[PDB]
Design a binder for this molecule. Structure first.
Ligand SMILES: Nc1ncnc2c1ncn2[C@@H]1O[C@H](COP(=O)(O)OP(=O)(O)O)[C@@H](O)[C@H]1O
Ligand SMILES: [Mg+2]
Length: 383
């Protein structure tokens, strides 16, 4: 039972082995079970200024706490919040086993805690499933996720092979957005990686061989995620969105927010002269996005109801107008129409996004021109 004041741990409790002889044990900092990580000061150097700066500010729940740091002759000891497992176990675990923590909100917690570091000009520099940790259930048993191992520098490239941004091997906050983008695909894909093989993933990162198979081209849910992930893992770091940019993405929106975006967009475009820059950018994509005539791809009850009062059919703007029209007037529509559409907001928005998978992603990119406006502030980062 080793004791280095104030930290207390016992061997044979080892939670896991790290890199460069790093070992983590189950131990107790004060009255409370903690995870004690033993590192070799010749290998890893602990950053005291970064840990202190984080401790002196408001603590983010999705960033892990470093309780104490103690040194003995041979080693350097660090105490961190004892956790149940890592993100790998979460992904490998069965869907029912997640204990109420959903994958999207998990990625949100990760990205939020990552933005909290970046707000302090702290770059994690190693981000990966093992450094994303799953908390132990609290009381009632709710669990969160916490990014961990930040503020550890390898003495003489930082990070773990396969999660390292290409420019580091070829640092600012965009290194973490790259690793996050790989983690994002890892969680969604249920274990797959943007670069498939473990041995050649880092090699593929350097030459940009990334491939996303698990995201279907025809599925709205997957098209939204695809557009977000590919920007994060983009080879050119200046094209990668910030942490707060990611949190505003449609990937994190609820269904009513998705429908609310479609409504708020239609009102702005109303209100826009055709050939104008906003409407021209919106109508650029499709054509294909709207599936030629969209009136052909919607159920017959809606087709007939639309015969009353002229919709283009090759226009995304007209399609957005029709969706806003049926939502505001939903109570007025015949029970045949309301049956094939609602309930609202959920089954209603899914009616259009399922039939037009690129509609939300397409509309979102075209409408970035309004990102600065006060009405679209919920949908975009105003900077
Ligand atoms: N706070 C913690 N609570 C429980 N287990 C942990 C904690 N931190 C790390 N571990 C375990 O230690 C192992 C290695 O950790 P670490 O030394 O950070 O190397 P790695 O980069 O592989 O995570 C992981 O597989 C993980 O299961
Ligand atoms: Mg770790």
């Amino acid at each position: 039972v080793v004791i280095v004041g104030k930290i207390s741990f016992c061997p044979k409790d080892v939670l896991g082995h790290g890199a460069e002889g790093t070992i983590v044990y189950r131990g107790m900092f004060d009255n409370r079970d903690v995870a004690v990580k033993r590192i070799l000061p010749e290998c890893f150097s602990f950053a005291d200024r970064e840990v202190q700066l984080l401790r002196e500010s408001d603590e983010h729940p999705n960033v892990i706490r470093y309780f104490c740091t103690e040194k003995d002759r041979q080693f350097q000891y660090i105490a961190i919040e004892l956790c149940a497992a890592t993100l790998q176990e979460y992904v490998e675990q069965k869907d029912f086993a997640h204990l109420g923590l959903e994958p999207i909100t998990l990625l949100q917690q990760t990205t939020s805690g990552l933005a909290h570091l970046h707000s302090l000009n702290i770059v994690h520099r190693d981000l990966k499933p093992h450094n994303i940790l799953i908390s132990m259930p609290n009381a009632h048993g709710k669990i969160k996720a916490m990014i961990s191992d930040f503020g550890l520098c390898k003495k003489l490239v930082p990070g773990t092979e396969g999660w390292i941004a290409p420019e580091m091997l070829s640092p600012t906050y965009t290194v973490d957005i790259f690793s996050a983008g790989c983690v994002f695909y890892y969680v969604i894909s249920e274990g797959s990686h943007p670069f498939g093989k473990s041995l050649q993933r880092q090699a593929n990162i350097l030459l940009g061989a990334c491939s996303l198979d698990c995201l279907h081209p025809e599925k709205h849910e997957d098209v939204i995620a695809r557009e977000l992930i590919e920007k994060m893992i983009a080879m050119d770091p200046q094209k990668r969105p910030s942490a707060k940019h990611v949190l505003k993405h449609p990937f994190f929106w609820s269904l009513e927010k998705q429908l609310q975006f479609f409504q708020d967009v239609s009102d702005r475009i109303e209100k826009e002269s055709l050939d104008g820059p906003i409407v021209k950018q919106l109508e650029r994509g499709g054509r294909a996005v709207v599936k030629m005539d969209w009136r052909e791809n919607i159920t017959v009850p809606l087709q007939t109801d639309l015969r009353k009062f002229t919709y283009k059919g090759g226009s995304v703007r007209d399609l957005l107008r029709a969706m806003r029209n049926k939502k505001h007037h939903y109570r007025e529509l015949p029970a045949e129409v309301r049956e094939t559409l609602g309930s609202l907001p959920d089954d209603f928005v899914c009616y259009f996004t399922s039939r037009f998978p690129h509609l939300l992603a397409h509309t979102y990119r075209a409408m970035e021109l309004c990102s600065h406006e006060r009405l679209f502030q919920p949908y975009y980062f105003h900077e």
